[PDB]
């Protein structure tokens, strides 16, 4: 029963092993969980719309809230979870969602009311609402407007612009903030201590620095570093270099070579060095980000050069965000910034 | 609480067959003198109203009325387990989230039990029945079904006209026109085949054939059907039960 | 009980006297109903202006407490096709009421999602059955309605809620709830609403939940800004000043510390800087052209994701290069 | 309240072809046809609210007299008008025997003919061809291109045009005289300006203004009906300086509750139908508007996108 | 041949020793293993390394696999036919074998399938539509104790950020020319080839650009022309499409007109009709146009800018020739 | 060669009705002691296995086993000519490209003969039946069909739970939950209605309702159905024939496995 769950969690990757089960495990998204804890004692949970960067804990927060609300018994009877792996057209929204909303709430047991608040409403959550078409979204308007007495709607998305304006107005907007080093160092250190991850001083803070506001990627990188340090068995501590090696970060010397080729060099030398660099597998997004950090941070370039480098890096990132060829985009970016 | 045991699951199944298709949501209410149920279609032209007295049951206990709403389709989906001869017991607490249907065979053997999820419906039972109708008539329900099934093919509207000693059903559409004329008569060789008519005022009303077709289903509950018509209100088609009745109120056309 | 509904649903207007903001249309509709000549209505407006509440209170005032039976209310949640029209709407219009005597009301809420064939079939239902029933079409976009259907109804444009009416509703809510609100906090709340009562009610409930107290204290600007995650005008103007005057590295550091100290979003800062720079009396419109173009491009890129630092540097560089033409 | 009164569009709906203030040529044509008889198959096309359905109704009534009930078959878009209906009911009506005067014929009125399916329209050809001596067909549509060419080849084509200022003014003056309403010249001018050749919309706005304020004045008309939307959009696009267009977009459109989709779409229409500027600059402005339309459809619809669209249009106009 | 000499375990790998050690570290504890995404240049050997890692997570029976068929029904009666590579320890799906119906196959098959878990290898994850990736986003997290994904791709550019975060990222850098030469040496000593001078092998690497799959295939193709005896000046065997692209660039730099644009469109049509992707065509065309010594830096910069623009266009469009002809016309206008 | 004559074409038609729908390809093999046939569905959760002994036929001759595969749909298409009372003879040479079905009426009168094209299927008959199952039970097949038809409406999964003297079928889904509880009992008034149960170990398995629905078809071949369950293998539902049996082996759902 519970022991099987404990063992399955212990044999699970750290992303799912340390998933927040209660509203207190949320480390940084405090403004939303404060309201969620206050409404736990009341019974006026409004329709909610979670939006923010990926890996901020929206799904974990709503799961912990539904748990703390309904208990592990009513967790499976008063919840309608619809993900992006299911059909969510107009037909589905009109039939299934509306039939579940029109239905009455299931009767709680005697053990439920003694430990959990058991609100008189159920919860219908729609994860990854970006893939929902606007007509199927507008179909949900009156469905969530008239049956609010018996069901509550929780939308979850990454881009709040993909959801129509009426739905965004009907739901309370909860913006999840990026999890940088400051507001996630406590959670990362807790995960490291619970797994006996022996690292150096500036490793964890560096990991989140590579994560760029993503605790899931940081936990995955920490798990990979711990596995790589346990395989060696040397008993030493994990270093920031070993972490940034497996994180896809280009070494500093290779980036300085690119800066030298951009500063001094013609089209042919730059093209040859780019062709050689693309042989070693590096993500073009990470290279663009590192070049942006170096160029904007270095206090040795003119402001007129800085405006142009910022606009060129922005254009290159916008083009790379569409599935383009990394080699062509990187070569074009380096050539355009070399003419400056 | 709700505790109603039907001798034969078949009676309840035929009753629900009557609400079937023409309505989606039904609001039941059990009380000290029995069970009532009302359902109105989306366009609000048809009301299906049921009344089952305490005596229609093999066992009925009620110390506290309970009102419960449910999806008709869900109910019928479950209403084919009665074996017809099975015993059926409807059960619910005073503040239900579900309705329990319990089918059992005479012997302890097989027990099929269902727990149907309820819907919350604002309690608002209508009381649109009239004291007097312009005209009243009863005739075998199988005859009424045939009359409706005939005319239906010709039009989406079937007119019922009543004059002294004459009842006339008429349909007129694309392929042509049709009419069925019946006259009152007492058959002593068996009065369940007689056709009675009491006319206080001639009437002439038109109904949507699609609705009359829904209504004829009541034939399975009673040998005769009573039809009460008025120019002031919805028409009443009634199918009597032993201690009870199933009524269909249908609003005339314009 | 009504204490379980959210504040957006709990405070839904039930009478025409509780619908604030709309006065020219509310009085005209009241006169239409009192004098008897109620034509086919077309309530066009943005979300959260009070069109559905207005028509619901109107039907309540017309038919009484039995509104839910004498009115045919169809919306996008229900199947609205051409056959649905042909059967349901025509049978409702051609027949009469089963509860009383009087004209009927068909409320086609959110009718901007109806099919073109459905509107083509309904435009002759509205013109044929016009002595015993009426039609009310609610819309947010007037381009999804055919011109034939658009010409048969009297159009009423629901303007966004002004300051007076939204403050009146806020005062009503503060009377109904054991809650106090600061004047500057109220002004900041009105600023982040754009005439949307839903947002105001939602964030008011959320900041009441944020109070953490038995509500013996007040709600200040800090509570509102920390609960809605919206940037403050102080940090907004500080970032704008550091971008316009200070150095590139210093501007980058200022933007980073501002967006990381309160967890602010880059899109909110972009919109705030756009709103602030709209009052700037500037030179030759080339700077405004470049600024608007680059800011809209960066906003459209943010609407799809990417590197937040790269986009922030892009915003800084775009504003700087746009203002470099003003010299 | 217990009951309502009939609207002025339905109450004062013309019942005789002389009361129609539409296109004079086609009106006198139909009047002479009803006087002499031998009504041919016809297709009346035009824009909504100019007197197309009323015209054919008046023609059928005047041509059939008392036999209108049993000689006219009305089929609107609200009724099923598929292949099965054309096969059964229309053919049964055309084959129906009816004793009529030696100058009249049975009339089949088909409202909204542009919505009939291709199969029904194809089947109607021989249906109207084999019974063209005792049954006549009158179609009323808004787009004549939606009706197949074989059907148009067997009938006359009557294209109704917009109603000039004089005709709508005369009809409104007749209605005011028949209703004893207090009005003024500027109020009627504003009504006709907001009507845009739409007689039905004009009468509806007049009745609404009367029932809302009593006096038909330009102030009341403007406060109860906003100005023609396309005109403010045209004035915004035709602005010479960027700040003027921005202030217009902010105050007139954005501060009054007009959605961004309506603004951009109305914007596209204004441009497409523009004639002040050349073709190439119009195409470039349409390109910029359509790029903004793209951005807006993806959910990025804000004021900044419309401001950038206006800035790009001005940059294109900036030589 | 490429297939006759291929490593089957982690100890049989012969390049990227750090990557082999990282794979051994990741396979030391196989049950607490997150999802993996192998990214890098095409032809590096990531598909062999994933199977070698599976050979460490499970028994040697992972290579004994079978091909089955599964049918799917879309919203209409069009039947989607998809073949599946299955093994008693893992299964492989390639959603790049159909059109916009990747989401249906992904969701249904993965839900049906969902040591103790069964591995899933998604081949060519770049062809996965955004809707299919969104559908897989929650399937990756809901079933993490029964299904582990090993997605093989050549560039994480079209992969969405949620999927990137939901799995570990493993880069596979192309092997150095020296390692390629050492591998070709063992191959030619095992296949009994005659080399007059060893340096030719190096040149093969210099003609493959890190690609081992292309290197071995070209070595074997030129070994059949020299009759199993490679000389000091054996010609380099280039694919037909590369020669067509080179002739196209020669035509471009020689003549810049609409009459030549017509035959350029004809060549593009003939290339696209023979199962050649348009992105690779554009990449090779641009890279070989930059190699033209007749042009200057001003021409090459405009060429690379137009190629990036039209690559974005092609990634946002579906009619590939509509973008290829536009890029060719823009290059003609530039020169 | 294959030479098997059924007294009544009806028996063969009902047998094939059992493979019908749930499987596409069937592999038959006739031999000295009778005919066997096996068919596995695409997802491999259901195996349909038939055995007809020599005595079930009116005439059977086999001096050389023949294995033949065919499309089930093609076979049933042809399997409605038996008049039920017609005589049916299955015929095939030792290396067949077809299978001949010969229906004849008593008198020489009418002779319907078919020549069905065969499919080549790699011969690989499975032998997954267990020595002992955790629990064994038999009950009237019409009763089992009703039990399955009841619960099916509620869910895509029907759980079978066995404890001492108790058999319980359960379904739980969207509209609610249902259960059918039956108890062992010997009816002497006619033992074909009895419900037997031998439990060596309590069992609790879940099956996909769509599959149980395919299986209930066997009611038409036998009055009773035997159900054998184990936590170690596919469940066995068996319908006895006079000299033979039709068996359905169904893999329990793992959590999601039909
Ligand atoms: N605030 C947080 N506190 C603790 N752990 C967190 C937090 N946010 C994310 N995590 C970890 O990251 C895992 C993923 O959480 P999710 O809620 O799925 O992230 P996400 O916001 O849903 O990203 P998506 O699904 O791509 S939009 C959790 O199981 C935790 O292990
Ligand atoms: N004028 C108003 N006065 C008071 N409360 C209002 C007003 N407008 C909106 N509200 C509040 O906002 C809620 C939603 O109003 P609705 O009428 O549903 O919005 P809407 O105008 O119909 O826009 P939609 O539904 O998105 S198209 C109401 O229940 C009120 O609580
Ligand atoms: N020429 C006219 N003279 C007088 N009243 C007119 C005239 N044209 C339209 N009207 C008024 O407008 C009402 C509706 O006219 P219709 O003929 O139905 O409009 P329409 O030209 O057919 O365009 P549709 O029906 O939208 S395609 C009539 O009942 C009259 O009140
Ligand atoms: N460790 C290795 N040692 C030697 N040759 C290898 C090794 N791994 C892969 N190869 C070979 O190098 C080539 C790489 O191409 P390919 O296998 O298509 O790459 P991928 O595995 O990424 O699809 C093939 O010929 C492959 O067999
Ligand atoms: Mg999520
Ligand atoms: Mg609304
Ligand atoms: Mg008309």
Curated annotation (Swiss-Prot), chain A:
Q: Where on this chain does ATP bind?
A: 15, 19, 52-60, 158, 216
The GO biological-process annotations, alphabetized, read as: DNA damage checkpoint signaling; DNA repair; DNA replication checkpoint signaling; DNA-templated DNA replication; leading strand elongation; mismatch repair; mitotic sister chromatid cohesion; sister chromatid cohesion
Q: InterPro entries given for it?
A: AAA+_ATPase, ATPase_AAA_core, DNA_pol3_clamp-load_cplx_C, DNA_Rep/Repair_Clamp_Loader, P-loop_NTPase, Rep_factorC_C, RFC_lid
A single GO cellular-component term from the record reads:
DNA replication factor C complex
Q: Where in the cell is it found?
A: Nucleus
Keyword terms: Acetylation, ATP-binding, Cell cycle, DNA replication, DNA-binding, Nucleotide-binding, Nucleus
Kindly list the GO molecular function terms attached to this UniProt entry.
ATP binding; ATP hydrolysis activity; DNA binding
Q: Name one Pfam family in it.
A: AAA
* Broad class of where this protein is predominantly found: nucleus
SUBUNIT field: Replication factor C (RFC) is a heteropentamer of subunits RFC1, RFC2, RFC3, RFC4 and RFC5 and forms a complex with POL30/PCNA in the presence of ATP. Component of the RAD24-RFC complex which consists of RAD14, RFC2, RFC3, RFC4 and RFC5 and associates with the checkpoint clamp DDC1:MEC3:RAD17 complex. Component of the ELG1-RFC complex which consists of ELG1, RFC2, RFC3, RFC4 and RFC5. Component of the CTF18-RFC complex, which consists of CTF18, CTF8, DCC1, RFC2, RFC3, RFC4 and RFC5. RFC2 interacts with ECO1.
Xref: NCBIfam families: PRK00440.1
What remark does the entry add?
Present with 4610 molecules/cell in log phase SD medium.
Q: Which family, according to the similarity comment?
A: Belongs to the activator 1 small subunits family.
Q: What is the name of the protein in this document?
A: Replication factor C subunit 2
UniProtKB/Swiss-Prot annotation, chain B:
| Free-text function comment from the UniProt entry | This protein is an auxiliary protein of DNA polymerase delta and is involved in the control of eukaryotic DNA replication by increasing the polymerase's processibility during elongation of the leading strand. Involved in DNA repair.
Q: Name one Pfam family in it.
A: PCNA_N
Biological process terms in GO annotation: error-free translesion synthesis; establishment of mitotic sister chromatid cohesion; lagging strand elongation; leading strand elongation; maintenance of DNA trinucleotide repeats; meiotic mismatch repair; mismatch repair; mitotic cell cycle
Q: Does the keyword DNA repair apply?
A: yes
What residue ranges does this record give for the DNA-binding region? 61-80
Where would I find the Glycyl lysine isopeptide (Lys-Gly) (interchain with G-Cter in SUMO) crosslink on this chain? 127, 164
- Which locations, inside or outside the cell, does it occupy? Nucleus
Q: What range does the record give for the signal peptide?
A: none
The reply on keyword DNA-binding is yes
Q: Which InterPro entries match?
A: DNA_clamp_sf, Pr_cel_nuc_antig, Pr_cel_nuc_antig_C, Pr_cel_nuc_antig_CS, Pr_cel_nuc_antig_N
Name this polypeptide is given: Proliferating cell nuclear antigen
Q: Which gene encodes it?
A: POL30
- Domain of life, per lineage: Eukaryota
Q: Where is this cross-link: Glycyl lysine isopeptide (Lys-Gly) (interchain with G-Cter in ubiquitin)?
A: 164
Q: Which GO terms describe its cellular component?
A: chromosome, telomeric region; nucleus; PCNA complex; replication fork
Curated annotation (Swiss-Prot), chain C:
SUPFAM superfamilies, per database record:
P-loop containing nucleoside triphosphate hydrolases, post-AAA+ oligomerization domain-like
Domain of life, per UniProt, equals Eukaryota
Q: Does the keyword Nucleus apply?
A: yes
Localization = Nucleus
The keyword ATP-binding is annotated on this UniProt entry: yes
Which keywords accompany this UniProt record? Answer: Acetylation, ATP-binding, Cell cycle, DNA replication, DNA-binding, Nucleotide-binding, Nucleus
- What processes does the entry annotate via GO biological process terms? DNA damage checkpoint signaling; DNA repair; DNA-templated DNA replication; leading strand elongation; mismatch repair; mitotic sister chromatid cohesion
GO MF annotations, alphabetized: ATP binding; ATP hydrolysis activity; DNA binding
The UniProt similarity line reads: Belongs to the activator 1 small subunits family.
- Assembly behavior: Replication factor C (RFC) is a heteropentamer of subunits RFC1, RFC2, RFC3, RFC4 and RFC5 and forms a complex with POL30/PCNA in the presence of ATP. Component of the RAD24-RFC complex which consists of RAD14, RFC2, RFC3, RFC4 and RFC5 and associates with the checkpoint clamp DDC1:MEC3:RAD17 complex. Component of the ELG1-RFC complex which consists of ELG1, RFC2, RFC3, RFC4 and RFC5. Component of the CTF18-RFC complex, which consists of CTF18, CTF8, DCC1, RFC2, RFC3, RFC4 and RFC5. RFC3 interacts with ECO1 and POL30/PCNA.
Miscellaneous comment: Present with 3140 molecules/cell in log phase SD medium.
**Protein's name in the database:** Replication factor C subunit 3
User: What species does this protein belong to?
Assistant: Saccharomyces cerevisiae (strain ATCC 204508 / S288c)
Report which gene this protein is encoded by.
RFC3
UniProtKB/Swiss-Prot annotation, chain E:
Where's it found, cell-wise?
Nucleus
Q: A cellular component term (GO) from this record?
A: Elg1 RFC-like complex
> What's an example Gene Ontology biological process for this entry?
DNA-templated DNA replication
What coarse category fits the chief subcellular location reported for this protein? nucleus
GO MF terms listed in the record are: ATP binding; ATP hydrolysis activity; DNA binding
Q: What are the binding positions for ATP in this chain?
A: 2, 14, 40-48, 213
Q: Which Pfam families match?
A: DNA_pol3_delta2, RCF1-5-like_lid, RFC_C
The UniProt keywords, alphabetically, are: ATP-binding, Cell cycle, DNA replication, DNA-binding, Nucleotide-binding, Nucleus
What else is noted?
Present with 5040 molecules/cell in log phase SD medium.
What does the record give as the function of this protein?
Component of ATP-dependent clamp loader (RFC and RFC-like) complexes for DNA clamps, such as the POL30/PCNA homotrimer and the checkpoint clamp DDC1:MEC3:RAD17 complex. During a clamp loading circle, the RFC:clamp complex binds to DNA and the recognition of the double-stranded/single-stranded junction stimulates ATP hydrolysis by RFC. The complex presumably provides bipartite ATP sites in which one subunit supplies a catalytic site for hydrolysis of ATP bound to the neighboring subunit. Dissociation of RFC from the clamp leaves the clamp encircling DNA.
Q: Of which family is this protein a member?
A: Belongs to the activator 1 small subunits family.
Mind telling me what this protein is named? Replication factor C subunit 5
Organism, scientific name: Saccharomyces cerevisiae (strain ATCC 204508 / S288c)
What does the organism's lineage look like at the top? Eukaryota, Fungi, Dikarya, Ascomycota, Saccharomycotina
């Amino acid at each position: 029963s519970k022991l099987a769950a404990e063992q399955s969690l212990a044999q699970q990757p750290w992303v799912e092993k340390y998933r927040p089960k209660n509203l207190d495990e949320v480390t940084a998204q405090d403004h939303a969980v404060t309201v969620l804890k206050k409404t736990l004692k009341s019974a006026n949970l409004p329709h909610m719309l979670f939006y923010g960067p990926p890996g901020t804990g929206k799904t974990s927060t709503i799961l912990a809230l539904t748990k703390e609300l309904y208990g592990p018994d009513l967790m499976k009877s008063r919840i309608l979870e619809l993900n992006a792996s299911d059909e969510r057209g107009i037909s589905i929204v009109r039939e299934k969602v509306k039939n579940f909303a029109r239905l009455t709430v299931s009767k709680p047991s005697k053990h439920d009311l003694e430990n959990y608040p058991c609100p008189p409403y159920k919860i219908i959550i729609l994860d990854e609402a970006d893939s929902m078409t606007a007509d199927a979204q507008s179909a949900l308007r009156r469905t969530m407007e008239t049956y609010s007495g018996v069901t509550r709607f929780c939308l979850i998305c990454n881009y709040v612009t993909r959801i129509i304006d009426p739905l965004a107005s009907r739901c309370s907007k909860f913006r999840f903030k990026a999890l940088d080093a400051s507001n996630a160092i406590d959670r990362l250190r807790f995960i490291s201590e619970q797994e006996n991850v022996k690292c150096d001083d500036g490793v964890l803070e560096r990991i989140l620095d590579i994560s760029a506001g993503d605790l899931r990627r940081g936990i995955t990188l920490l798990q990979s570093a711990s596995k790589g340090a346990q395989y060696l068995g040397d008993g030493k501590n994990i270093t920031s270099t070993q972490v940034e090696e497996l994180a896809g970060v280009v070494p500093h010397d290779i980036l300085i070579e690119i800066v030298e080729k951009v500063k001094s060099g013609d089209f042919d030398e730059i093209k040859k060095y780019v062709n050689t660099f693309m042989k070693s597998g590096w993500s073009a997004a990470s290279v663009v980000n590192q070049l942006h950090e170096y160029y904007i941070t270095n206090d040795n370039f003119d402001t007129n050069f800085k405006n142009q480098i910022s606009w060129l890096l922005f254009t290159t990132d916008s083009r790379l965000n569409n599935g383009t060829n990394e080699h062509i985009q990187l070569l074009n970016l380096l050539v355009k910034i070399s003419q400056l | 609480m709700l505790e109603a045991k039907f001798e034969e699951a078949s009676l309840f199944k035929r009753i629900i067959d009557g609400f079937k298709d023409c309505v989606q949501l039904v609001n039941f209410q059990c009380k000290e003198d029995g069970i009532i149920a009302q359902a109105v279609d989306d366009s609000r032209v048809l009301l299906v109203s049921l009344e089952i007295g305490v005596e229609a049951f093999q066992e009925y206990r009620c110390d506290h009325p309970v009102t419960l709403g449910m999806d008709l389709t869900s109910l019928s989906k479950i209403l084919r387990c009665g074996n017809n001869t099975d015993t059926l017991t409807l059960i619910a607490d005073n503040t239900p989230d579900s309705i329990i249907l319990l089918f059992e065979d005479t012997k302890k053997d097989r027990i099929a039990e269902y727990s149907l999820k309820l819907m919350d419906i604002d309690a608002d039972f209508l009381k649109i029945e009239e004291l007097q109708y312009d005209s009243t008539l009863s005739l075998p329900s199988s005859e009424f079904s045939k009359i409706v099934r005939d005319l239906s093919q010709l039009s989406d509207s079937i007119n019922i006209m009543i004059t002294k000693e004459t009842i006339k059903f008429v349909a007129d559409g694309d392929i042509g026109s049709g009419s069925v004329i019946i006259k009152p008569f007492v058959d002593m060789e068996h009065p369940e085949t007689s056709i009675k008519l009491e006319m206080d005022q001639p009437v002439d009303l038109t109904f949507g054939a699609k609705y009359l077709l829904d209504i004829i289903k009541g034939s399975s509950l009673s040998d005769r059907v009573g039809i009460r018509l008025s120019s002031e209100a919805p028409a009443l088609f009634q199918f009597d039960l032993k201690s009870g009745f199933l009524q269909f109120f249908l609003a005339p056309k314009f | 009980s009504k204490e379980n509904l959210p504040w957006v649903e709990k405070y839904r207007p039930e009478t025409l006297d509780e619908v604030y903001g709309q006065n020219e249309v509310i009085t005209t509709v009241r006169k239409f109903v009192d004098e008897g000549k109620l034509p086919h209505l077309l309530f066009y407006g943005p979300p959260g202006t009070g069109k559905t509440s207005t028509i619901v209170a109107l039907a309540r005032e017309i038919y009484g407490k039995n509104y839910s039976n004498m009115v045919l209310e169809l919306n996008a949640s229900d199947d609205r096709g051409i056959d649905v029209v042909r059967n349901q709407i025509k049978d409702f219009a051609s027949t009469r009421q089963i509860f009383s005597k009087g004209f009927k009301l068909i409320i086609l809420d959110e009718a901007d999602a109806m099919t073109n064939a459905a509107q083509n079939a309904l435009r002759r239902v509205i013109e044929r059955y016009t002595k015993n029933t009426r039609f009310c079409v609610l819309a947010n976009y007037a381009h999804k309605l055919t011109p034939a259907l658009l010409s048969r109804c009297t159009r009423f444009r629901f303007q966004p809620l002004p300051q007076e009416a939204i403050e009146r509703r806020i005062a009503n809510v503060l009377v109904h709830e054991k809650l106090k609100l600061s004047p500057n906090a109220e002004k900041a709340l009105i600023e982040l609403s754009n005439g949307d009562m839903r947002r105001v009610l939602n964030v008011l409930q959320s900041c009441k939940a944020t109070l953490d107290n038995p509500d013996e204290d007040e709600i200040s600007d800090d509570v509102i800004y920390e609960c809605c995650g919206a940037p403050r005008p102080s940090d907004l103007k500080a970032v704008l000043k550091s971008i316009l005057e200070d150095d590139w590295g210093t501007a980058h550091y200022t933007l980073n510390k501002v967006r990381s100290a309160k967890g602010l979003a880059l899109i909110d800062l972009i919109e705030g800087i756009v709103k602030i720079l709209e009052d700037y009396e500037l030179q030759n419109e080339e700077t405004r052209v470049h600024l608007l173009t680059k800011l809209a491009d960066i906003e459209y890129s943010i609407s799809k994701g990417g590197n937040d630092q790269i986009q922030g540097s892009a915003v800084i560089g775009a504003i700087k290069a746009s203002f470099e033409n003003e010299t | 309240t217990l009951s309502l009164q009939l609207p002025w569009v339905e109450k004062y709906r013309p019942q005789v072809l002389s009361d129609i203030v539409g296109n004079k040529e086609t009106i006198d044509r139909l009047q002479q046809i009803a006087k002499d008889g031998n009504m041919p198959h016809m297709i009346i096309s035009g824009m909504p609210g100019i007197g197309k359905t009323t015209s054919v109704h008046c023609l059928a009534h005047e041509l059939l007299g008392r036999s209108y009930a049993d000689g006219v078959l009305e089929l609107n878009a609200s009724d099923d008008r598929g292949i099965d209906v054309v096969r059964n009911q229309i053919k049964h009506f055309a084959q129906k025997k009816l004793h009529l005067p030696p100058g009249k014929h049975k009339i089949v009125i088909l409202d909204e003919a542009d919505s009939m399916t291709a199969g029904a329209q194809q089947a109607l050809r021989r249906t109207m061809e084999l019974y063209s001596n005792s049954t006549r067909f009158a179609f009323a549509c808004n787009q004549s291109n939606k009706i197949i060419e074989p059907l148009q080849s067997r009938c006359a084509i009557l294209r109704y045009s917009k109603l000039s200022d004089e005709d709508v003014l005369k009809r409104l003056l007749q209605i005011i005289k028949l209703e004893d309403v207090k009005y003024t010249n500027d109020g009627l001018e504003a009504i006709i300006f907001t009507a845009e050749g739409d007689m039905r919309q004009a009468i509806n706005n007049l009745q609404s203004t009367v029932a809302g304020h009593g006096l038909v004045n330009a102030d009341n008309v403007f406060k109860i009906v906003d100005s023609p939307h396309p005109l403010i959009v045209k004035k915004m696009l035709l602005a010479s300086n960027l700040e003027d267009s921005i202030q217009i977009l902010r105050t007139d459109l954005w501060k009054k509750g007009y959605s961004s989709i309506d603004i951009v779409t109305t914007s596209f229409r204004v441009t497409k139908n523009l004639a002040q500027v050349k073709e190439s600059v119009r195409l470039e402005m349409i390109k910029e508007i359509g790029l903004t339309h793209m951005r807006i459809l993806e959910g990025v619809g804000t004021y900044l996108q419309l401001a950038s669209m206006l800035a790009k249009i001005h940059k294109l106009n900036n030589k | 041949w490429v297939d006759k000499y291929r490593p089957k375990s982690l100890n049989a790998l012969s390049h990227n020793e750090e990557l082999t050690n990282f794979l051994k570290s990741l396979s030391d504890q196989p049950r607490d293993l997150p999802h993996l995404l192998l990214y890098g240049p095409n032809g590096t050997g990531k598909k062999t390394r994933c199977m070698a890692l599976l050979e460490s997570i499970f028994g040697p029976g992972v290579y004994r696999l079978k091909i089955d068929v599964r049918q799917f029904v879309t919203a209409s009666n069009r039947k989607l036919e998809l073949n599946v590579v299955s093994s008693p320890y893992h299964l492989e799906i390639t959603p790049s074998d159909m059109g916009n119906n990747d989401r249906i196959v992904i969701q249904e098959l993965l839900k049906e399938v969902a040591h103790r878990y069964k591995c899933v290898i998604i081949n060519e994850a770049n062809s996965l539509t955004k809707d299919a990736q969104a559908a897989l986003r929650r399937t990756m997290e809901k079933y993490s104790k029964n299904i582990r994904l090993i997605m093989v791709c050549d560039s994480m550019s079209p992969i969405i950020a949620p999927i990137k975060s939901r799995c570990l990222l493993i880069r596979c850098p192309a092997p150095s020319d020296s390692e390629i030469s050492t591998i070709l040496s063992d191959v030619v000593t095992n296949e009994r080839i005659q080399l007059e001078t060893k340096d030719i092998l190096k040149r093969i690497a210099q003609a493959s650009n890190g690609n081992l799959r292309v290197s071995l295939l070209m070595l074997e193709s030129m070994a059949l022309n020299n009759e199993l005896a490679l000389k000091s000046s054996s010609p380099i065997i280039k694919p037909d499409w590369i020669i067509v692209i080179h002739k196209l660039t020669r035509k471009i730099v020689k003549e810049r007109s609409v009459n030549s644009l017509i035959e350029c469109r004809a060549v593009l049509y003939d290339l696209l009709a023979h199962c050649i992707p348009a992105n690779i065509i554009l990449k090779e065309l641009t890279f070989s146009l930059l190699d033209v010594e007749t042009l200057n830096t001003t021409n090459k910069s405009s060429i690379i800018e137009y190629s990036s623009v039209f690559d974005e266009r092609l990634s946002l469009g579906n009619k590939a020739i509509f973008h290829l002809e536009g890029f060719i016309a823009k290059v003609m206008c530039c020169l």
